[PDB]
Design an enzyme around this catalytic site. Structure first.
Site, short mmCIF file in Angstrom:
data_model
loop_
_atom_site.label_atom_id
_atom_site.label_comp_id
_atom_site.label_asym_id
_atom_site.label_seq_id
_atom_site.Cartn_x
_atom_site.Cartn_y
_atom_site.Cartn_z
N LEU A 1 0.80 -1.22 0.00
CA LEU A 1 0.00 0.00 0.00
C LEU A 1 0.84 1.27 0.00
O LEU A 1 0.27 2.36 -0.09
CB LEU A 1 -0.95 0.02 1.20
CG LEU A 1 -1.78 -1.24 1.42
CD1 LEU A 1 -2.89 -1.05 2.46
CD2 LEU A 1 -2.33 -1.70 0.10
N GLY A 2 2.16 1.18 0.11
CA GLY A 2 2.94 2.40 0.14
C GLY A 2 4.28 2.19 0.81
O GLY A 2 4.50 1.22 1.54
N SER A 3 5.19 3.13 0.55
CA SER A 3 6.56 3.06 1.07
C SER A 3 7.00 4.39 1.69
O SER A 3 8.05 4.94 1.35
CB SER A 3 7.53 2.64 -0.03
OG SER A 3 7.64 1.22 -0.07
N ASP B 1 -1.05 16.72 15.07
CA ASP B 1 -0.99 16.68 13.61
C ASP B 1 -2.33 16.28 13.00
O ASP B 1 -2.39 15.54 12.00
CB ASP B 1 0.14 15.76 13.11
CG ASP B 1 0.38 15.88 11.58
OD1 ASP B 1 -0.09 16.86 10.94
OD2 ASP B 1 1.05 14.96 11.02
N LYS C 1 2.77 -2.66 8.88
CA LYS C 1 3.87 -1.73 8.65
C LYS C 1 5.13 -2.38 9.23
O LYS C 1 5.30 -2.43 10.45
CB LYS C 1 3.58 -0.38 9.30
CG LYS C 1 4.15 0.81 8.54
CD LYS C 1 4.61 1.91 9.49
CE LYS C 1 3.58 2.18 10.59
NZ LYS C 1 3.62 3.57 11.10
N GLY D 1 9.08 3.14 6.45
CA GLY D 1 9.17 1.76 5.99
C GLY D 1 8.25 1.38 4.84
O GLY D 1 8.32 2.00 3.78
N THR D 2 7.39 0.38 5.04
CA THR D 2 6.48 -0.13 4.01
C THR D 2 5.22 -0.71 4.63
O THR D 2 5.31 -1.52 5.56
CB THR D 2 7.16 -1.22 3.19
OG1 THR D 2 8.44 -0.75 2.76
CG2 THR D 2 6.31 -1.59 1.97
C1 LIG Z 1 -1.97 4.99 3.90
C2 LIG Z 1 -3.09 4.26 3.15
C3 LIG Z 1 -4.45 4.78 3.63
C4 LIG Z 1 -2.93 4.57 1.66
C5 LIG Z 1 -2.97 2.74 3.38
N1 LIG Z 1 -3.77 2.25 4.49
C6 LIG Z 1 -5.00 1.73 4.46
N2 LIG Z 1 -5.80 1.57 3.25
N3 LIG Z 1 -5.37 1.40 5.71
C7 LIG Z 1 -4.34 1.72 6.54
C8 LIG Z 1 -4.10 1.62 7.96
C9 LIG Z 1 -2.87 2.07 8.45
C10 LIG Z 1 -1.91 2.60 7.58
C11 LIG Z 1 -0.53 3.12 8.01
N4 LIG Z 1 0.05 4.12 7.39
C12 LIG Z 1 1.24 4.34 7.95
C13 LIG Z 1 2.21 5.42 7.56
C14 LIG Z 1 1.44 6.68 7.18
C15 LIG Z 1 3.07 5.65 8.81
C16 LIG Z 1 3.04 4.96 6.36
N5 LIG Z 1 1.42 3.46 8.93
C17 LIG Z 1 0.35 2.68 8.98
C18 LIG Z 1 0.24 1.57 10.03
C19 LIG Z 1 0.27 1.99 11.36
C20 LIG Z 1 0.20 1.06 12.38
C21 LIG Z 1 0.09 -0.28 12.07
F1 LIG Z 1 0.00 -1.19 13.10
C22 LIG Z 1 0.05 -0.70 10.74
C23 LIG Z 1 0.13 0.23 9.71
N6 LIG Z 1 -2.17 2.68 6.28
C24 LIG Z 1 -3.34 2.24 5.77
#
Ligand SMILES: CC(C)(C)Cn1c(N)nc2ccc(-c3[nH]c(C(C)(C)C)nc3-c3ccc(F)cc3)nc21
Length: 280
Positions: free
Chosen positions: A23-25, A135, A47, A26-27
Protein backbone atom coordinates in the site's frame (compact mmCIF):
# COMPACT_ATOMS: atom_id res chain seq x y z
CA UNK A 1 -4.46 11.38 40.01
CA UNK A 2 -3.57 10.09 36.55
CA UNK A 3 -4.94 6.61 36.04
CA UNK A 4 -2.71 3.59 35.27
CA UNK A 5 -2.65 2.86 31.54
CA UNK A 6 -3.67 -0.80 31.63
CA UNK A 7 -3.88 -1.10 27.84
CA UNK A 8 -2.55 -4.45 26.61
CA UNK A 9 0.21 -4.69 23.99
CA UNK A 10 -0.23 -7.82 21.88
CA UNK A 11 2.80 -9.56 20.38
CA UNK A 12 2.10 -11.45 17.14
CA UNK A 13 3.98 -14.36 15.64
CA UNK A 14 4.99 -13.63 12.04
CA UNK A 15 3.17 -16.96 11.49
CA UNK A 16 -0.18 -15.31 12.34
CA UNK A 17 -0.56 -12.98 9.35
CA UNK A 18 0.22 -12.84 5.64
CA UNK A 19 1.08 -9.85 3.46
CA UNK A 20 -0.86 -9.56 0.19
CA UNK A 21 -0.17 -6.25 -1.53
CA UNK A 22 1.91 -3.14 -0.99
CA UNK A 23 0.00 0.00 0.00
CA UNK A 24 2.94 2.40 0.14
CA UNK A 25 6.56 3.06 1.07
CA UNK A 26 9.17 1.76 5.99
CA UNK A 27 6.48 -0.13 4.01
CA UNK A 28 2.74 -0.77 4.59
CA UNK A 29 0.87 -3.88 3.37
CA UNK A 30 -2.66 -4.92 2.83
CA UNK A 31 -2.77 -8.32 4.51
CA UNK A 32 -4.81 -10.84 6.43
CA UNK A 33 -4.41 -11.69 10.14
CA UNK A 34 -5.46 -15.10 11.48
CA UNK A 35 -5.28 -14.94 15.30
CA UNK A 36 -3.60 -18.06 16.67
CA UNK A 37 -6.17 -20.85 16.91
CA UNK A 38 -9.32 -18.77 16.51
CA UNK A 39 -10.90 -19.46 13.07
CA UNK A 40 -11.29 -15.74 12.26
CA UNK A 41 -9.54 -13.79 9.48
CA UNK A 42 -8.99 -10.06 9.93
CA UNK A 43 -8.07 -7.62 7.13
CA UNK A 44 -5.14 -5.55 8.31
CA UNK A 45 -2.51 -3.02 7.36
CA UNK A 46 0.99 -4.17 8.32
CA UNK A 47 3.87 -1.73 8.65
CA UNK A 48 7.29 -3.41 8.78
CA UNK A 49 10.23 -1.05 9.21
CA UNK A 50 13.21 -0.57 6.84
CA UNK A 51 17.85 2.37 12.50
CA UNK A 52 16.98 4.01 15.90
CA UNK A 53 13.69 5.20 14.52
CA UNK A 54 12.81 1.97 16.34
CA UNK A 55 12.07 4.40 19.19
CA UNK A 56 9.61 6.35 17.01
CA UNK A 57 7.48 3.34 15.98
CA UNK A 58 7.23 2.03 19.56
CA UNK A 59 5.78 5.40 20.64
CA UNK A 60 3.14 5.15 17.91
CA UNK A 61 2.39 1.56 18.97
CA UNK A 62 2.24 2.72 22.60
CA UNK A 63 -0.32 5.39 21.69
CA UNK A 64 -2.31 3.29 19.20
CA UNK A 65 -2.56 0.54 21.81
CA UNK A 66 -3.96 2.84 24.47
CA UNK A 67 -6.91 4.13 22.47
CA UNK A 68 -10.19 2.36 21.86
CA UNK A 69 -12.90 4.39 20.14
CA UNK A 70 -14.89 3.90 16.93
CA UNK A 71 -13.23 6.98 15.36
CA UNK A 72 -9.59 6.42 16.33
CA UNK A 73 -7.31 3.77 14.83
CA UNK A 74 -6.38 1.03 17.35
CA UNK A 75 -3.25 -1.13 17.34
CA UNK A 76 -4.00 -4.77 16.74
CA UNK A 77 -0.50 -5.99 17.65
CA UNK A 78 3.21 -5.77 17.09
CA UNK A 79 5.65 -8.33 15.77
CA UNK A 80 9.25 -8.15 16.97
CA UNK A 81 10.89 -9.88 14.06
CA UNK A 82 14.28 -8.55 12.92
CA UNK A 83 12.25 -5.45 12.02
CA UNK A 84 9.33 -4.11 13.97
CA UNK A 85 5.99 -4.87 12.29
CA UNK A 86 2.88 -3.03 13.46
CA UNK A 87 -0.49 -4.55 12.63
CA UNK A 88 -3.69 -2.50 12.51
CA UNK A 89 -7.12 -2.55 10.91
CA UNK A 90 -7.28 -2.24 7.12
CA UNK A 91 -8.94 1.07 6.14
CA UNK A 92 -10.19 0.04 2.70
CA UNK A 93 -11.09 3.41 1.15
CA UNK A 94 -7.68 5.00 1.95
CA UNK A 95 -7.22 8.43 3.51
CA UNK A 96 -10.11 10.90 3.54
CA UNK A 97 -8.07 13.63 1.77
CA UNK A 98 -7.49 11.48 -1.30
CA UNK A 99 -11.06 10.23 -1.08
CA UNK A 100 -12.58 13.69 -1.04
CA UNK A 101 -10.46 14.57 -4.09
CA UNK A 102 -11.26 11.37 -6.00
CA UNK A 103 -15.03 11.51 -5.36
CA UNK A 104 -15.77 15.24 -5.03
CA UNK A 105 -18.44 15.25 -7.74
CA UNK A 106 -20.44 12.67 -5.79
CA UNK A 107 -19.88 13.67 -2.16
CA UNK A 108 -23.02 15.17 -0.64
CA UNK A 109 -23.64 17.43 2.34
CA UNK A 110 -24.74 14.55 4.61
CA UNK A 111 -21.40 12.80 4.17
CA UNK A 112 -19.32 15.92 4.76
CA UNK A 113 -21.26 16.86 7.91
CA UNK A 114 -21.10 13.32 9.28
CA UNK A 115 -17.33 13.19 8.76
CA UNK A 116 -17.13 16.43 10.74
CA UNK A 117 -19.15 14.75 13.49
CA UNK A 118 -17.10 11.57 13.56
CA UNK A 119 -13.81 13.47 13.61
CA UNK A 120 -15.00 15.66 16.50
CA UNK A 121 -16.05 12.47 18.28
CA UNK A 122 -12.61 10.93 17.83
CA UNK A 123 -10.82 14.13 18.84
CA UNK A 124 -13.04 14.45 21.91
CA UNK A 125 -12.04 10.90 22.88
CA UNK A 126 -8.34 11.77 22.54
CA UNK A 127 -9.11 14.72 24.84
CA UNK A 128 -10.80 12.44 27.35
CA UNK A 129 -7.68 10.25 27.31
CA UNK A 130 -5.61 13.40 28.02
CA UNK A 131 -4.06 13.01 24.58
CA UNK A 132 -2.90 15.68 22.14
CA UNK A 133 -2.64 14.78 18.47
CA UNK A 134 -0.56 17.74 17.27
CA UNK A 135 -0.99 16.68 13.61
CA UNK A 136 -4.74 16.56 12.95
CA UNK A 137 -5.27 16.91 9.20
CA UNK A 138 -7.38 15.54 6.39
CA UNK A 139 -4.39 13.47 5.20
CA UNK A 140 -4.40 11.75 8.63
CA UNK A 141 -8.06 10.58 8.66
CA UNK A 142 -8.71 7.16 7.18
CA UNK A 143 -11.93 5.87 5.64
CA UNK A 144 -13.16 2.46 6.71
CA UNK A 145 -16.41 2.87 4.81
CA UNK A 146 -17.67 6.14 3.30
CA UNK A 147 -19.93 6.31 6.36
CA UNK A 148 -17.12 5.76 8.82
CA UNK A 149 -13.78 7.54 9.15
CA UNK A 150 -11.11 7.21 11.84
CA UNK A 151 -8.35 9.51 13.11
CA UNK A 152 -4.83 8.18 12.55
CA UNK A 153 -1.05 8.99 12.34
CA UNK A 154 -0.03 8.86 15.98
CA UNK A 155 3.62 9.68 15.36
CA UNK A 156 3.30 13.20 16.82
CA UNK A 157 0.66 12.26 19.44
CA UNK A 158 1.55 13.20 23.05
CA UNK A 159 -0.15 12.58 26.41
CA UNK A 160 6.28 20.22 10.92
CA UNK A 161 2.88 21.14 9.31
CA UNK A 162 2.90 24.89 9.82
CA UNK A 163 -0.22 25.51 7.68
CA UNK A 164 -2.37 23.43 10.08
CA UNK A 165 -1.11 24.85 13.38
CA UNK A 166 -2.64 27.06 16.04
CA UNK A 167 -0.83 30.39 16.34
CA UNK A 168 0.59 29.54 19.77
CA UNK A 169 2.03 26.40 18.15
CA UNK A 170 3.73 28.35 15.35
CA UNK A 171 5.17 30.92 17.77
CA UNK A 172 6.02 29.06 20.98
CA UNK A 173 5.77 25.34 20.13
CA UNK A 174 2.79 25.21 22.58
CA UNK A 175 0.23 22.41 22.07
CA UNK A 176 -3.20 21.92 23.68
CA UNK A 177 -6.42 20.14 23.03
CA UNK A 178 -7.37 23.68 21.91
CA UNK A 179 -4.32 23.71 19.67
CA UNK A 180 -5.91 20.63 18.08
CA UNK A 181 -9.23 22.43 17.64
CA UNK A 182 -7.49 24.94 15.36
CA UNK A 183 -6.24 22.04 13.26
CA UNK A 184 -9.75 20.59 13.35
CA UNK A 185 -10.87 23.85 11.72
CA UNK A 186 -8.29 23.55 8.97
CA UNK A 187 -9.28 19.91 8.44
CA UNK A 188 -12.95 20.79 8.02
CA UNK A 189 -11.97 23.49 5.55
CA UNK A 190 -10.08 20.79 3.62
CA UNK A 191 -13.23 18.64 3.43
CA UNK A 192 -15.48 21.61 2.75
CA UNK A 193 -13.24 22.53 -0.23
CA UNK A 194 -13.04 18.93 -1.57
CA UNK A 195 -9.34 18.75 -0.75
CA UNK A 196 -7.97 22.19 -1.52
CA UNK A 197 -4.49 22.95 -0.06
CA UNK A 198 -4.63 25.52 2.75
CA UNK A 199 -2.82 28.81 2.07
CA UNK A 200 -1.89 27.45 -1.36
CA UNK A 201 1.26 29.21 -2.55
CA UNK A 202 1.67 31.30 0.60
CA UNK A 203 5.16 30.43 1.94
CA UNK A 204 4.91 29.05 5.46
CA UNK A 205 7.34 31.68 6.78
CA UNK A 206 4.57 34.23 6.14
CA UNK A 207 1.78 32.10 7.67
CA UNK A 208 2.56 33.15 11.22
CA UNK A 209 2.42 36.85 10.26
CA UNK A 210 -0.78 36.83 8.17
CA UNK A 211 -2.62 35.16 11.05
CA UNK A 212 -1.40 37.99 13.25
CA UNK A 213 -2.85 40.43 10.70
CA UNK A 214 -6.19 38.72 11.52
CA UNK A 215 -6.45 36.83 8.22
CA UNK A 216 -7.88 33.29 7.97
CA UNK A 217 -8.83 30.71 5.34
CA UNK A 218 -11.69 31.90 3.07
CA UNK A 219 -15.29 30.66 3.31
CA UNK A 220 -15.57 27.63 1.00
CA UNK A 221 -18.18 28.02 -1.73
CA UNK A 222 -20.50 25.27 -0.45
CA UNK A 223 -20.51 26.65 3.09
CA UNK A 224 -23.36 28.52 4.63
CA UNK A 225 -22.18 31.19 7.01
CA UNK A 226 -23.31 28.85 9.80
CA UNK A 227 -20.67 26.29 8.89
CA UNK A 228 -17.98 28.86 8.14
CA UNK A 229 -18.73 30.61 11.45
CA UNK A 230 -17.80 27.37 13.20
CA UNK A 231 -14.56 27.03 11.28
CA UNK A 232 -13.70 30.61 12.13
CA UNK A 233 -14.17 30.09 15.87
CA UNK A 234 -11.59 27.27 15.72
CA UNK A 235 -9.15 30.00 14.67
CA UNK A 236 -9.52 32.58 17.43
CA UNK A 237 -6.08 33.64 18.58
CA UNK A 238 -7.45 33.35 22.13
CA UNK A 239 -7.36 29.56 22.45
CA UNK A 240 -10.03 29.63 25.18
CA UNK A 241 -12.33 31.35 22.73
CA UNK A 242 -12.13 28.34 20.40
CA UNK A 243 -14.92 25.73 20.61
CA UNK A 244 -14.66 22.52 22.60
CA UNK A 245 -14.60 19.24 20.71
CA UNK A 246 -17.77 18.24 22.60
CA UNK A 247 -19.49 21.35 21.25
CA UNK A 248 -18.37 20.78 17.68
CA UNK A 249 -19.95 17.31 18.00
CA UNK A 250 -23.21 18.98 18.99
CA UNK A 251 -23.12 21.72 16.35
CA UNK A 252 -22.27 19.60 13.35
CA UNK A 253 -24.76 16.97 14.55
CA UNK A 254 -27.46 19.65 14.65
CA UNK A 255 -26.63 20.42 11.03
CA UNK A 256 -26.18 16.78 9.93
CA UNK A 257 -29.89 16.54 10.84
CA UNK A 258 -30.79 18.89 7.92
CA UNK A 259 -27.65 18.96 5.80
CA UNK A 260 -28.88 20.90 2.77
CA UNK A 261 -29.75 23.85 5.03
CA UNK A 262 -26.05 24.22 5.84
CA UNK A 263 -24.08 23.09 2.75
CA UNK A 264 -25.19 24.04 -0.76
CA UNK A 265 -23.85 21.48 -3.20
CA UNK A 266 -24.74 21.17 -6.88
CA UNK A 267 -26.54 17.85 -7.11
CA UNK A 268 -27.48 16.71 -3.59
CA UNK A 269 -10.68 -17.17 0.09
CA UNK A 270 -12.85 -14.81 2.19
CA UNK A 271 -15.16 -16.99 4.33
CA UNK A 272 -14.37 -16.47 8.04
CA UNK A 273 -13.54 -12.77 7.53
CA UNK A 274 -14.39 -10.49 10.46
CA UNK A 275 -13.88 -6.76 10.57
CA UNK A 276 -11.42 -5.65 13.25
CA UNK A 277 -14.17 -3.50 14.87
CA UNK A 278 -15.95 -6.78 15.72
CA UNK A 279 -12.85 -8.62 17.00
CA UNK A 280 -12.65 -8.08 20.78
C1 LIG B 1 -1.97 4.99 3.90
C2 LIG B 1 -3.09 4.26 3.15
C3 LIG B 1 -4.45 4.78 3.63
C4 LIG B 1 -2.93 4.57 1.66
C5 LIG B 1 -2.97 2.74 3.38
N1 LIG B 1 -3.77 2.25 4.49
C6 LIG B 1 -5.00 1.73 4.46
N2 LIG B 1 -5.80 1.57 3.25
N3 LIG B 1 -5.37 1.40 5.71
C7 LIG B 1 -4.34 1.72 6.54
C8 LIG B 1 -4.10 1.62 7.96
C9 LIG B 1 -2.87 2.07 8.45
C10 LIG B 1 -1.91 2.60 7.58
C11 LIG B 1 -0.53 3.12 8.01
N4 LIG B 1 0.05 4.12 7.39
C12 LIG B 1 1.24 4.34 7.95
C13 LIG B 1 2.21 5.42 7.56
C14 LIG B 1 1.44 6.68 7.18
C15 LIG B 1 3.07 5.65 8.81
C16 LIG B 1 3.04 4.96 6.36
N5 LIG B 1 1.42 3.46 8.93
C17 LIG B 1 0.35 2.68 8.98
C18 LIG B 1 0.24 1.57 10.03
C19 LIG B 1 0.27 1.99 11.36
C20 LIG B 1 0.20 1.06 12.38
C21 LIG B 1 0.09 -0.28 12.07
F1 LIG B 1 0.00 -1.19 13.10
C22 LIG B 1 0.05 -0.70 10.74
C23 LIG B 1 0.13 0.23 9.71
N6 LIG B 1 -2.17 2.68 6.28
C24 LIG B 1 -3.34 2.24 5.77
Amino acid sequence: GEAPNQALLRILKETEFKKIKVLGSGTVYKGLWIPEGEKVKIPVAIKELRPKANKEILDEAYVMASVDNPHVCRLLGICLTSTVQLITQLMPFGCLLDYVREHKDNIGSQYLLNWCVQIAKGMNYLEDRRLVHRDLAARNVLVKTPQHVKITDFGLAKLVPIKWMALESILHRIYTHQSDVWSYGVTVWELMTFGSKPYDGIPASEISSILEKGERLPQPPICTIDVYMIMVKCWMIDADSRPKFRELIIEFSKMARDPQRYLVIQGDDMDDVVDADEYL
